[PDB]
């Protein structure tokens, strides 16, 4: 399975993942491609903020589903 | 000039609060008291696995926009 991650600019990030991969793992794979450390990442699926301790299968995320990425650049 | 934060209990219920990063943990407990009826002295708040201390601010603990705190009750 590949997942898709949408940025604010409109750029799509394509990731290689397994259902057993946690959100922490998913974020860590985003770091590899954009250079954004996981603490500054906030991931959304269909309106829900994703929790770092949960798997892709916990949220029932399947192949080619789109996630949204909002970055923590300013602390306000 | 506040941000949204979430407080989760074991029971599953989530509470939406409006708090300043410069607010104390004492203030948040007070806000939880207003919305739920839960006295502050019986409240225990947890962020990123650690217990939050009353005199400290959300900014002390790096509590951010849409961050989630957990509520554990005392008995």
């Amino acid at each position: 399975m590949q997942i898709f991650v949408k940025t604010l600019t409109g750029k799509t990030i394509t990731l290689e993942v397994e259902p057993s991969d946690t959100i922490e793992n998913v974020k860590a794979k985003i770091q590899d491609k954009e250079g954004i450390p996981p603490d500054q990442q906030r991931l959304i699926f269909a309106g829900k903020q994703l929790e770092d301790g949960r798997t892709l299968s916990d949220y029932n995320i399947q192949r080619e589903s789109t996630l949204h990425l909002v970055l923590r650049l300013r602390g306000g | 000039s506040h941000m949204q934060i979430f407080v989760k209990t074991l029971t599953g219920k989530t509470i939406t609060l409006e708090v300043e990063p410069s607010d104390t943990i004492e203030n948040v407990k007070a806000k939880i008291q207003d919305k739920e009826g839960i006295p502050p002295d019986q409240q225990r708040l947890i962020f990123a696995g650690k217990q939050l201390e009353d005199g400290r601010t959300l900014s002390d603990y790096n509590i951010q926009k849409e961050s989630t705190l957990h509520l554990v009750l005392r008995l």
Partner: antibody
Amino acid sequence: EVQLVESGGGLVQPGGSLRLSCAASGFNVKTGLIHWVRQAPGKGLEWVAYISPYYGSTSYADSVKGRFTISADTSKNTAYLQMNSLRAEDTAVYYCAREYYRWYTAIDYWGQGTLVTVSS
Amino acid sequence: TQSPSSLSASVGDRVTITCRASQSVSSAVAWYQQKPGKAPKLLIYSASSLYSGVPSRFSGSRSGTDFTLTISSLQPEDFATYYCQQYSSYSSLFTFGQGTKVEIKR
């Protein structure tokens, strides 16, 4: 160890232009924002501009808006300040500095600054 | 824009500088310390929290629309110039206040 080193300071004539560089190490410029702040001899700090190198987002002080342009080069890990229609009041020590989400808007690492002097 | 204002105190004194720079601003207010010929250092962020490695004699408070920097007991290395920084959410402008220079009284 995060370090920011400004450079490109010096002399220009009123109406002229200069380009300042802010090179960062131990830290990726795109993981936060980058600021220029200046300080004329014997006077206070004046905020100049910031940029968010990840998005291209910029913001400038009024005293500087139409004649200064802040930029970035992520590959070089550097931020630039293109100053134009420069005038005597612009004579100052220009610092770059970064803001990192954890400090809620505050600027946490500053370079030692570079002297820009605008005069005929 | 202007020369710093001046305050004289002795080692051991309490000092509370109050921030002027702007109007409704925010609550994200930072305070910096600067010594002559050197670059500014961050002390307090978002009004009341201490930046990494700042001595506990420094504290920051908000009341109404006024922000205060307090040094509870002046040490020799605290004699310097202080600045508050304000940030307008709306206009995305940062503003540094006048600058208070705490000098040694004798």
